[PDB]
Amino acid sequence: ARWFPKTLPCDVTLDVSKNHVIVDCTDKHLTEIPGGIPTNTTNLTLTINHIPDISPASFHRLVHLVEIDFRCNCVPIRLGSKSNMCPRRLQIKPRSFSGLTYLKSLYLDGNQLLEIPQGLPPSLQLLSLEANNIFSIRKEQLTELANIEILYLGQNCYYRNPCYVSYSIEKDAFLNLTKLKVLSLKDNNVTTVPTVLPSTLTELYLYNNMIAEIQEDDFNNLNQLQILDLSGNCPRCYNAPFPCTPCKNNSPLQIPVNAFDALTELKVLRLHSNSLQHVPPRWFKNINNLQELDLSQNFLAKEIGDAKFLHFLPNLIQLDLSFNFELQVYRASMNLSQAFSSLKSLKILRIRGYVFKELKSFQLSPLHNLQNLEVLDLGTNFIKIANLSMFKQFKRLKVIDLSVNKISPVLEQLYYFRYDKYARSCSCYKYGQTLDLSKNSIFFIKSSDFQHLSFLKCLNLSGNLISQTLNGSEFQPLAELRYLDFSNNRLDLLHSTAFEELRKLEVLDISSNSHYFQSEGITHMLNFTKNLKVLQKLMMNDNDISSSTSRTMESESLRTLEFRGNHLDVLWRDGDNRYLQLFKNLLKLEELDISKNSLSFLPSGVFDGMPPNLKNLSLAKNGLKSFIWEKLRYLKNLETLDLSHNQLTTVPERLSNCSRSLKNLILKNNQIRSLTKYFLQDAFQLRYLDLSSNKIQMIQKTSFPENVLNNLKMLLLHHNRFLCTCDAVWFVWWVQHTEVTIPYLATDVTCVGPGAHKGQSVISLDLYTCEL
Amino acid sequence: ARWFPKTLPCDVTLDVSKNHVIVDCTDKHLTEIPGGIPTNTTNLTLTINHIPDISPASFHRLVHLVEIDFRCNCVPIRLGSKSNMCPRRLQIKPRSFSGLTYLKSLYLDGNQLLEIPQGLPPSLQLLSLEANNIFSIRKEQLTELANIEILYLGQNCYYRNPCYVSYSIEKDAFLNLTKLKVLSLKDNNVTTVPTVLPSTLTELYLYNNMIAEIQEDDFNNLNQLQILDLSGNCPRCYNAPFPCTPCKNNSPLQIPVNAFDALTELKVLRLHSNSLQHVPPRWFKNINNLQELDLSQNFLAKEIGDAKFLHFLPNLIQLDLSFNFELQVYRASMNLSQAFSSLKSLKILRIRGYVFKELKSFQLSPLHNLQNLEVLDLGTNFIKIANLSMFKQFKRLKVIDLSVNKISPVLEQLYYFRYDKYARSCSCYKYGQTLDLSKNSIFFIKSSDFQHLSFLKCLNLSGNLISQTLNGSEFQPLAELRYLDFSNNRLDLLHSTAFEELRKLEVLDISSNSHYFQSEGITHMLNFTKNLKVLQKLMMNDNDISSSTSRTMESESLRTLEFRGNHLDVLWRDGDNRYLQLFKNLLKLEELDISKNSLSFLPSGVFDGMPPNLKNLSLAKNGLKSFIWEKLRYLKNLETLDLSHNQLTTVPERLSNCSRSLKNLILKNNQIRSLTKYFLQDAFQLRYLDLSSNKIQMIQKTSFPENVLNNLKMLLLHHNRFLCTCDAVWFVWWVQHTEVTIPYLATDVTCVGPGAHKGQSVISLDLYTCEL
Ligand SMILES: CCC[C@@H](CCO)Nc1nc(N)nc2cnn(Cc3ccc(CNC4CCOCC4)cc3OC)c12
Ligand SMILES: CCC[C@@H](CCO)Nc1nc(N)nc2cnn(Cc3ccc(CNC4CCOCC4)cc3OC)c12
Ligand SMILES: *[C@@H]1O[C@H](CO)[C@@H](O[C@@H]2O[C@H](CO)[C@@H](O)[C@H](O)[C@H]2NC(C)=O)[C@H](O)[C@H]1NC(C)=O
Ligand SMILES: *[C@@H]1O[C@H](CO)[C@@H](O[C@@H]2O[C@H](CO)[C@@H](O)[C@H](O)[C@H]2NC(C)=O)[C@H](O)[C@H]1NC(C)=O
Ligand SMILES: *[C@@H]1O[C@H](CO)[C@@H](O[C@@H]2O[C@H](CO)[C@@H](O)[C@H](O)[C@H]2NC(C)=O)[C@H](O)[C@H]1NC(C)=O
Ligand SMILES: *[C@@H]1O[C@H](CO)[C@@H](O)[C@H](O)[C@H]1NC(C)=O
Ligand SMILES: *[C@@H]1O[C@H](CO)[C@@H](O)[C@H](O)[C@H]1NC(C)=O
Ligand SMILES: *[C@@H]1O[C@H](CO)[C@@H](O)[C@H](O)[C@H]1NC(C)=O
Ligand SMILES: *[C@@H]1O[C@H](CO)[C@@H](O)[C@H](O)[C@H]1NC(C)=O
Ligand SMILES: *[C@@H]1O[C@H](CO)[C@@H](O)[C@H](O)[C@H]1NC(C)=O
Ligand SMILES: *[C@@H]1O[C@H](CO)[C@@H](O)[C@H](O)[C@H]1NC(C)=O
Ligand SMILES: *[C@@H]1O[C@H](CO)[C@@H](O)[C@H](O)[C@H]1NC(C)=O
Ligand SMILES: *[C@@H]1O[C@H](CO)[C@@H](O)[C@H](O)[C@H]1NC(C)=O
Ligand SMILES: *[C@@H]1O[C@H](CO)[C@@H](O)[C@H](O)[C@H]1NC(C)=O
Ligand SMILES: *[C@@H]1O[C@H](CO)[C@@H](O)[C@H](O)[C@H]1NC(C)=O
Ligand SMILES: *[C@@H]1O[C@H](CO)[C@@H](O)[C@H](O)[C@H]1NC(C)=O
Ligand SMILES: *[C@@H]1O[C@H](CO)[C@@H](O)[C@H](O)[C@H]1NC(C)=O
């Protein structure tokens, strides 16, 4: 046990490897810099707090600092919290940083700062001033920043943080910063490319601005430049989910043909949402090392059919030409240029939102000999007609995405339509070849549909209109298939011979296929699992299963079954003993999720009819009012038990008398008010205990023995109704001097009383009066 | 040992017998009321602090308070500290006390208060407002104080705290205080007796004021009155050591003959310094229960010879008639009235400063039959001639004081001449009959001087001019004598037969008789102790003894010897081995004080030549630079060792190996910088350790075993040079969590560094950084 309790409301970590003393005070509702931070502290984080000022006294002793993270302490109105708004901007007093000799990184994002903090140490390499109110950069301001390498000045003038004027940058403002490597000026209302920039630059971000034209001499000296982003300058504002204003007369970002002549070392060129109509081949005359080219959200639908520029990119790896569609035009077919065959290196190709009625083998002919091609993304294209057998010339490919289409007989939810994807805050693919057909209109399936696709390892048929009775003669060609996602469909389990043709299948997802289970008298064959000789994981979540024609599910291979969101309460209706041995015959089963099954009580015989090798069992979100803990004696292999979000008021008299196997117990979000006299007594196998978010008042030494407690990896106690009287004298002392990992010890492990101590942390408590 | 360290800078005590939670913060340099005082607190003391205000928030939780001691927090300029002066008077905000339902006592003395604190609880019994600036009492102000029993309003307008006006009291101001028992108005510039006072009063103090006359009806209703003080009204200002102003024309305090007619229950009447010339017998017509009458500092020298009033006082116990002398008259003899014989009850009689040349048996004749008489004080009388054989008619008497006179062949230093002896802040007699002849002019003594005084048990001849060679034939009659104080004389130890005639003597004090020891070649016989067969204690302090004709002191009875302030360094001069066994032959000796003997080093053989039963040994204030601890193996009965105020730098490697008996070790005010690796290891007999006022930086677990430390009754560590680094991690934790009585833990047990911790108490320290 500890000699001195850790009273500091910050997570202190030690990294002797790099001699870093990391102090983390992220979102600890601070109003002052916490007193008593180690002198040997190097990395200090104070994000999402309410510290109103930074005076020299702030970092006084800690002269060993190398990083200061003072982000979002006064986050702008439109970007930050409306319940707890910032009253006055962060006040940085002079000589606050100049003393910190060893400082290398300084983050001051979202603090409503009016100017570049002067008096900074010459050791600084990184300076972040994002989301502040600095929209006038002058040469005098950056004189102190001589040694800076990475500079973030972005988000200082945009729709979420306006300045109502254009961004101003002095002539040759960044020119004397002879060590500058990274420069971000994103989301700033910048009208023209700041010049002259230092030749030492390698990354340049000028996206989401007022730049309407590029000069030929704009990047004449940036020979060392590797990444350049000129996106959101003359944007394609159609269906934009953010205030978007395009260049007058819908004009594109005017770039001279010889503008990228100096950028020999350029690898990434992002030209997303620039209203571009033509891509001149002359652009890439001297860039033979380009690997990533983002040409999404432009008007290059006609240019895709020509694309003479592709001949100058034989080293290109990534090509994004998404949402280049001409509105009012619903194309019959996709015109792909024969030039796409000259992309000898290309691994990733993305052509979403081209918009066309029909997909044919002939259309994809220029890609037929692209040896390195791994990904083909043709999603959100409204393709009505497509013959899947055409992808036999694409066996080498890892992912063939056709998600969100209208075919009938991993990137984020918002990727191409978000203002800034790289904005800062405060999956079956592994199995092999994947064909994504999710969110389509396939209403009926047959063996002939998957002809020649024997090679597939994963197939996604989620969100289709398959309202069929499968007899195991629908996916006959897919012999190699290991994963099938059949979620969000209308599966009809009339036959127990369903899915049996997929003889190599390891993962089956039949979740959210509730339609037929939601109607009375319909035959449901859940014993279909028996024929799947290699099935490892099965998901039948949110299916509303209240009836079953088969009394048992059979399997000699299955290890994981997700049965969350069904009606086991109806299958297990007290008096009805027919479905109590339902999961008993899934012999190799180790994991069983029977959460969200409306089980207010578990009928006697559920524990006896459990598979022999069950390890992890969840009964979470069931509204369980009563539980017979003693019955866990049947679950002889049990290690984990999730009983979170229930109505349980009492723990067992002796946990060791219930299970000798049980390691991790979860009892969070219940109604427990008091633990039993000798609860955890003699339960030496226990390694994890969550008792957080309950109504517990007192915890005694008998209920929580030290020999049992000191072997726990983590003990969760936060959000309880703790009474800090003289009877809680053991608990207060134990919690303070323990080595056991108690999370939120200085934010949610607090007293509800008596009076004097109401709303005070138990860690800060001093019950010396109980000792006089 | 403790679970929660006591961090509060106040001495917290618990007396479950009276249910009092006593919190004492006397002189703890406080500027705010210390946070975290027990809620169960009843008695709270905050004297000699710098708390500038009292707001309702002050005693918020502690509603169980019965006593509040908020004295001297703003003590007036002339009365308080000049280095740390009070800037602005104590500010008592409204409703600060009204909430404290159970409050009984409230002390607000010396806070420069301008008015009576309003809004006080109706439960209050005692209110103290001494040394404030309240010199105008109005009826409206005391309406809240309905239930008050004891009231202190004194020292609000005197020479140390002026108000430059007369004290004002409304007509019938205290009349409605129907429960008032005590009322002090001392040192207040009061011109007339406040009337009408409540009949319920028992104690009245009106001393040191401007009262020139008493009215007959002034005490007409105070039938219950027990004590009345009217002193310092028309004072005797001759030789006054304070600004004294007497009544015009040196007039006495005019008291009507019938003024004390209502005071039947009066027991104490103090009329000190009232310039009185005649005491009318009519005063005591109805007071037959009076026991204490103070008539000192008046002009009753002629009245002492008449004293017709003494016939009305046959129940009187104490009679003080000191300093009544007439300036310009050095009387031939003391004229005592034959009326003194009517004082059948009198135990104490004091007649100092009558000023007379000669004392004779005949003069004291009225006291010859006073059966109860115990004390006769005839000091500071300038008596030139007196025959001590006259006190044979005073064998019954306990004390016959003749101290400070000019005879030649317990009260304080300032008692009769101090402004206020009862002012508030922020001895052989036990042996039997005593004759005090100290501070006289006796130059020669003989057996005939003490003729008939065989009965005496204690004789004080301190501070006389006895420059004699005693041969043991000077005090032959004093056979019963058990104590002789012969200090401050010029004893000449030419004969070893000195003092031998006092065959029943237990205590002899020959201290400060340095005269002859301060001159070379003179014979000194210290072996004179041998003939005193019952001597228990001997004091020969500050005698400057550097030589002795006798090499050894012999005694079979002596148990205590004080040899402080001599020159043992010269007697024990390295090379001179003659006086090393000096104290060896005092066999029954248990205590030996050899402090202040200029012993920078102890010569080898001093320990071997020590009496066999020595228990307590002081070597304090010697300037001891080096000590051979191992040599304590000779002192086989030693329990206490005082080595305070020396130049010692090191402790022994193992204290347990130096003595087997040592219980209490004192090492305060030394130069110790570090303790030995296993200092207190196995020292099971140790119970007291004073390591205070040294230069110790660190203390380790090995030096202070937990097994030895618990046996310690008290451990003194304060005023040391403690370094609060990570090496002091054990010491900081031990001190915080120990039950061992460590005094000044929150005022002098503090860090000298490193930087961050400089001037911080070790009890408040949190070295959690040393644990990460
Ligand atoms: C009203 C609900 C009754 C159950 C009874 C199934 O024994 N029917 C059905 N349940 C489900 N889940 N889906 C469908 C879809 N069509 N049908 C009707 C149906 C189909 C086939 C057969 C069985 N025919 C076989 C019998 C053996 O020789 C070969 C033909 C009988 C049917 O209804 C009685 C369904
Ligand atoms: C110069 C210092 C020498 C010492 C020597 C003492 O053996 N004398 C004296 N020391 C002290 N402390 N005080 C006095 C006061 N008078 N005398 C002189 C004195 C007195 C008596 C005797 C001894 N007479 C006794 C001896 C025994 O048969 C009967 C006569 C001798 C003296 O000086 C030599 C003193
Ligand atoms: C502590 O702060 C340092 C300096 O700010 C961080 O160092 C960076 O570490 C990454 C690798 O983790 C490197 O790629 C960067 O180049 C380093 N930056 C500098 C300026 O040296 C470090 O990661 C921080 N550690 C934690 C846990 O916050
Ligand atoms: C970007 O800069 C333009 C100016 O170039 C800002 O537009 C002005 O806004 C004010 C207040 O809304 C108007 O009164 C002016 O007429 C506008 N001028 C022009 C030329 O349009 C614009 O507000 C800035 N953007 C942001 C987000 O602050
Ligand atoms: C006691 O009251 C008297 C008033 O009766 C004060 O005496 C006055 O003092 C002021 C200032 O020292 C003088 O201007 C007056 O002339 C004084 N008057 C008289 C009649 O003495 C006296 O100062 C008060 N005593 C104290 C201790 O404050
Ligand atoms: C593709 O588009 C180009 C124009 O961009 C056109 O000349 C060509 O004929 C088209 N090819 C096909 C097969 O549609
Ligand atoms: C789909 O293409 C394959 C050849 O890849 C062909 O055998 C099959 O008949 C086609 N399907 C239809 C419905 O035309
Ligand atoms: C199948 O596609 C859907 C999107 O329609 C997605 O939610 C799911 O995660 C995909 N399946 C796999 C195995 O990743
Ligand atoms: C399965 O159903 C198909 C029609 O979907 C039918 O042609 C086939 O004969 C059926 N096979 C069996 C074994 O039921
Ligand atoms: C499934 O369920 C019933 C028996 O309960 C039976 O009709 C059917 O043939 C069983 N099939 C398998 C695969 O066990
Ligand atoms: C505590 O306060 C009460 C009331 O004033 C008093 O009678 C008692 O003697 C006090 N005791 C101490 C130790 O202060
Ligand atoms: C004592 O004094 C009184 C006067 O006070 C006087 O009458 C009397 O004779 C004196 N007696 C003696 C003995 O001095
Ligand atoms: C002292 O008084 C006594 C009687 O008390 C007497 O015998 C003796 O002679 C007196 N002595 C002197 C020196 O006056
Ligand atoms: C003897 O009188 C003196 C005062 O002259 C005093 O210091 C000493 O304490 C008295 N002796 C005793 C035994 O009290
Ligand atoms: C003691 O001293 C006295 C006084 O000086 C003297 O009369 C007597 O003879 C001395 N006796 C001896 C034996 O010294
Ligand atoms: C004191 O010692 C001296 C010699 O040192 C001797 O003459 C004298 O008689 C001794 N007295 C006693 C009482 O021992
Ligand atoms: C001191 O220690 C030594 C060695 O440990 C031992 O021989 C000796 O007797 C000890 N002496 C005492 C007084 O304890």
Dump the DSSP string for A649-717.
Answer: ----S-STTT-SS--EEE--SS------TTTTTT-TT--EEE--SS------TTTS-HHHHTT-SEEE-
C-alpha to C-alpha distance for A331 and B351, rounded to whole angstroms: 134
User: In sequence order, which residues have a C-beta less than 8 Å from that of residue A579 and are 6 or more positions away?
Assistant: A548, A551, A571, A572
On the CB side of B199, CA atoms within 13 Å amount to 5
Contact B2 A769 (CB under 8 A): no
Amino acid letter for position A638: L
Distance A447 CA to ligand 7 centre (A): 12
Q: Which residues pair with A591 in a beta bridge?
A: A560, A616
Residues of B in contact with A10 (CB under 8 A): none
Strands A537-539 and A507-509 turn out to be parallel
Nearest residue to A465 (alpha-carbon basis) of A438, A484, A485, A447? A438
Nearest residue to A279 (alpha-carbon basis) of A250, A249, A258, A310? A310
Nearest residue to A283 (alpha-carbon basis) of A252, A304, A311? A311
User: In 10 A of CB B425, how many CB atoms?
Assistant: 8
Strand spans (E) along B149-218: 150-152, 168-169, 182-184, 203-205
Distance A158 CA to ligand 3 centre (A): 29
A·B CB contacts under 8 A: 64
User: In 10 A of CB B85, how many CB atoms?
Assistant: 11
CA torsion A697-A701-A707-A711 (nearest 10°) is 10
Closest CA of chain A from B38, distance in Å: 6
For this PDB entry, the determination method is X-ray
- Report in angstroms the alpha-carbon separations of B278 from A399, B215, B237, B314: 128, 18, 18, 20
Using a CB–CB cutoff of 8 Å, tell me whether A752 touches chain B. Answer: no
Instruction: Output DSSP code: residue A284.
Output: G
Q: Whose CA is nearest to atom 13 of ligand 12?
A: B335
B63 lines ligand 13 (CB under 6 A): no
- Report in angstroms the alpha-carbon separations of B396 from B347, B409, B410, B433, B483: 11, 26, 19, 8, 18
Q: Which residue, chain included where needed, has tokens 């800034």?
A: A420
Structure tokens at B184: 């002090």
C-alpha to C-alpha distance for A409 and A402, rounded to whole angstroms: 15
- Report in angstroms the alpha-carbon separations of B154 from A280, B134, B182: 105, 9, 12
Q: In B, residues 691-730, which contact A (CB 8 Å cutoff)? A: 729
Residues of A in contact with B39 (CB under 8 A): 756, 769
Tell me how far the alpha carbon of residue A704 is from its chain's centroid: 37
User: In 10 A of CB B326, how many CB atoms?
Assistant: 13
C-alpha to C-alpha distance for B324 and A424, rounded to whole angstroms: 97
3-class DSSP assignment, residue A53 = strand
Residues of B in contact with A771 (CB under 8 A): 2-4, 6
- The answer to whether the CB of A673 falls within 8 A of the CB of A650 is no
Select the residue of B4, B8, B21 nearest A767 (Cβ to Cβ). B4
Instruction: Output DSSP code: residue B736.
Output: H
User: In 10 A of CB B112, how many CB atoms?
Assistant: 18
Q: What is the largest CA-CA distance in chain B?
A: 91
Four-residue CA torsion sign, A295, A298, A303, A304: positive
Using a CB–CB cutoff of 8 Å, tell me whether B7 touches chain A. Answer: yes
Contact A38 B2 (CB under 8 A): no
- Report in angstroms the alpha-carbon separations of B85 from B73, B74, B82, B162, B595: 10, 8, 5, 17, 39
- B432 phi-psi bin (left φ>0, alpha ψ -120 to 50, beta other): left
Structure tokens at A65: 């600092």
Whether the ω angle into residue B196 lies within 30 degrees of 0, i.e. cis, is yes
User: In sequence order, which residues have a C-beta less than 8 Å from that of residue A709 and are 6 or more positions away?
Assistant: A680, A715, A734, A738, A740
User: In 10 A of CB B16, how many CB atoms?
Assistant: 7
Amino acid letter for position B579: Y
Residues of B in contact with A769 (CB under 8 A): 38-40
Amino acid letter for position B32: E
Q: Which strand (E) or helix (H) includes residue B518?
A: none
- The answer to whether the CB of B19 falls within 8 A of the CB of B41 is no
- The answer to whether the CB of B429 falls within 8 A of the CB of B399 is yes
3-class DSSP assignment, residue A734 = helix
User: In 10 A of CB A278, how many CB atoms?
Assistant: 13
Nearest residue to B234 (alpha-carbon basis) of B260, B255, B218? B255
> What is the radius of gyration, based on Cα positions, of chain B?
32
- The answer to whether the CB of A513 falls within 8 A of the CB of A492 is no
Nearest CA in chain B to A62: B756
Q: Which residue, chain included where needed, has tokens 């309460």?
A: A569
Contact A767 B7 (CB under 8 A): no
Residues of A in contact with B40 (CB under 8 A): 769
- Report in angstroms the alpha-carbon separations of A82 from A87, A113, B170: 11, 19, 64
Q: What angle do CA B281, B199, B117 make, to 5 degrees?
A: 125
Contact A755 B4 (CB under 8 A): no
- The answer to whether the CB of A174 falls within 8 A of the CB of A199 is no
CA torsion A715-A718-A721-A723 (nearest 10°) is 70
- The answer to whether the CB of B696 falls within 8 A of the CB of B674 is yes
Q: Which residues of B390-422 are buried (b: 16+ CB within 10 A; e: fewer)?
A: bbeebeebbbbbbbbbebeeeeeeeebeebbee
User: In sequence order, which residues have a C-beta less than 8 Å from that of residue B175 and are 6 or more positions away?
Assistant: B196, B197, B198
Distance B123 CA to ligand 11 centre (A): 15
Residue A346 has phi, psi (to 5 degrees) of -40, 125
Count of all residues that appear for chain A in the document:
772
Tell me how far the alpha carbon of residue B57 is from its chain's centroid: 39
Q: Which strand (E) or helix (H) includes residue B38?
A: none
- The answer to whether the CB of B34 falls within 8 A of the CB of B761 is no
Q: Which strand (E) or helix (H) includes residue A157?
A: none
Distance A658 CA to ligand 6 centre (A): 75
User: In sequence order, which residues have a C-beta less than 8 Å from that of residue B30 and are 6 or more positions away?
Assistant: B9, B46, B49, B50, B51
C-alpha to C-alpha distance for B171 and B190, rounded to whole angstroms: 14
- A125 phi-psi bin (left φ>0, alpha ψ -120 to 50, beta other): alpha
End-to-end Cα spacing for chain B? 23
Q: Which residues of B500-521 are buried (b: 16+ CB within 10 A; e: fewer)?
A: bbbeebbbbbbbbbbebbeeee
Q: What angle do CA B215, B216, B220 make, to 5 degrees?
A: 115
3-class DSSP assignment, residue B707 = helix
Nearest-ligand number for the alpha carbon of A453: 7
Residues of B in contact with A39 (CB under 8 A): 756, 769
Using a CB–CB cutoff of 8 Å, tell me whether B770 touches chain A. Answer: yes
User: In sequence order, which residues have a C-beta less than 8 Å from that of residue A396 and are 6 or more positions away?
Assistant: A371, A373, A374
User: In sequence order, which residues have a C-beta less than 8 Å from that of residue B672 and are 6 or more positions away?
Assistant: B648, B649, B650, B651, B691, B694, B695, B696
Nearest CA in chain A to B731: A3
Nearest CA in chain B to A765: B4
C-alpha to C-alpha distance for A186 and A160, rounded to whole angstroms: 13
Using a CB–CB cutoff of 8 Å, tell me whether B410 touches chain A. Answer: no
3-class DSSP assignment, residue B766 = coil
Label residue A413 exposed, middle or buried (CB < 10 Å: 0-12, 13-18, 19+). Answer: exposed
Q: What angle do CA B380, B381, B382 make, to 5 degrees?
A: 100
Contact A14 B772 (CB under 8 A): yes
Q: Which domains does chain B have, with CATH numbers?
A: 1-772 (3.80.10.10)
Q: What is the 3-state secondary structure (H, E, C) of B640-705?
A: EEECCCCCCCCCCCCHHHCCCCCCEEECCCCCCCCCCCCCCCCCCCCCEEECCCCCCCCCCCCCCC
Contact B771 A38 (CB under 8 A): no
Select the residue of A40, A61, A756 nearest B39 (Cβ to Cβ). A756
- The answer to whether the CB of A233 falls within 8 A of the CB of A209 is yes
Q: Which strand (E) or helix (H) includes residue A730?
A: helix A729-737
C-alpha to C-alpha distance for B352 and B378, rounded to whole angstroms: 5
- The answer to whether the CB of B574 falls within 8 A of the CB of B550 is no
Q: Which residues pair with A642 in a beta bridge?
A: A618, A666
Residue A283 has phi, psi (to 5 degrees) of -55, -50
Nearest residue to B111 (alpha-carbon basis) of B67, B153, B69, B73? B73
Tell me how far the alpha carbon of residue A463 is from its chain's centroid: 22
- The answer to whether the CB of A258 falls within 8 A of the CB of A216 is yes
In chain A, which residues are last before a break of more than 2.5 Å from C to the next N? 409, 426
C-alpha to C-alpha distance for B603 and B574, rounded to whole angstroms: 6
Contact B772 A38 (CB under 8 A): yes
Contact A733 B4 (CB under 8 A): yes
% helix, strand, coil for chain A, step of 5? 10, 15, 75
Nearest CA in chain B to A737: B3
Q: Where are the alpha helices (DSSP H) in B367-474?
A: none
Nearest residue to B602 (alpha-carbon basis) of B635, B568, B578? B568
Nearest-ligand number for the alpha carbon of A164: 4
C-alpha to C-alpha distance for A365 and A382, rounded to whole angstroms: 21
- The answer to whether the CB of A632 falls within 8 A of the CB of A602 is no
Using a CB–CB cutoff of 8 Å, tell me whether A1 touches chain B. Answer: no
3-class DSSP assignment, residue A422 = coil
C-alpha to C-alpha distance for A310 and B66, rounded to whole angstroms: 94
Tell me how far the alpha carbon of residue A761 is from its chain's centroid: 32
Structure tokens at B748: 């002098």
C-alpha to C-alpha distance for B13 and B5, rounded to whole angstroms: 15
Structure tokens at B262: 């209502």
CA torsion A332-A338-A342-A347 (nearest 10°) is 20
Closest atom, ligand 9, to C-alpha of A468: 5
Instruction: Output DSSP code: residue B761.
Output: B
C-alpha to C-alpha distance for B128 and B71, rounded to whole angstroms: 9
On the CB side of A284, CA atoms within 13 Å amount to 22
Nearest residue to B663 (alpha-carbon basis) of B649, B642, B677, B679? B642
Four-residue CA torsion sign, B118, B119, B125, B127: negative
Q: Which residues pair with B358 in a beta bridge?
A: B333, B385
C-alpha to C-alpha distance for A108 and A131, rounded to whole angstroms: 9
Structure tokens at B408: 């030649």
- The answer to whether the CB of A385 falls within 8 A of the CB of A357 is yes
User: In sequence order, which residues have a C-beta less than 8 Å from that of residue B483 and are 6 or more positions away?
Assistant: B428, B431, B457, B458, B459, B505, B506, B507
On the CB side of B3, CA atoms within 13 Å amount to 19
Select the residue of A36, A38, A772 nearest B14 (Cβ to Cβ). A772
> What is the radius of gyration, based on Cα positions, of chain A?
32
C-alpha to C-alpha distance for A384 and A254, rounded to whole angstroms: 37
Closest CA of chain A from B711, distance in Å: 20
Q: Whose CA is nearest to atom 11 of ligand 16?
A: B496
Distance A470 CA to ligand 9 centre (A): 9
Strands B20-24 and B11-15 turn out to be antiparallel
User: In sequence order, which residues have a C-beta less than 8 Å from that of residue A300 and are 6 or more positions away?
Assistant: A276, A277, A278, A279, A321, A324
Structure tokens at A766: 């001093």
C-alpha to C-alpha distance for A222 and A266, rounded to whole angstroms: 10
User: In sequence order, which residues have a C-beta less than 8 Å from that of residue B430 and are 6 or more positions away?
Assistant: none
Q: In B, residues 593-632, which contact A (CB 8 Å cutoff)? A: none
Residue B515 has phi, psi (to 5 degrees) of -30, -60
Q: What angle do CA B116, B119, B122 make, to 5 degrees?
A: 105
User: In sequence order, which residues have a C-beta less than 8 Å from that of residue B162 and are 6 or more positions away?
Assistant: none
Q: Which residues pair with A579 in a beta bridge?
A: none
Contact B769 A733 (CB under 8 A): no
Residues whose beta carbon lies within 6 Å of some atom of ligand 9: A 471, 473
Mutate to test the pocket of ligand 6, among A278, A300, A306 (most ligand atoms within 8 A of CB): A306
Instruction: Output DSSP code: residue A74.
Output: S
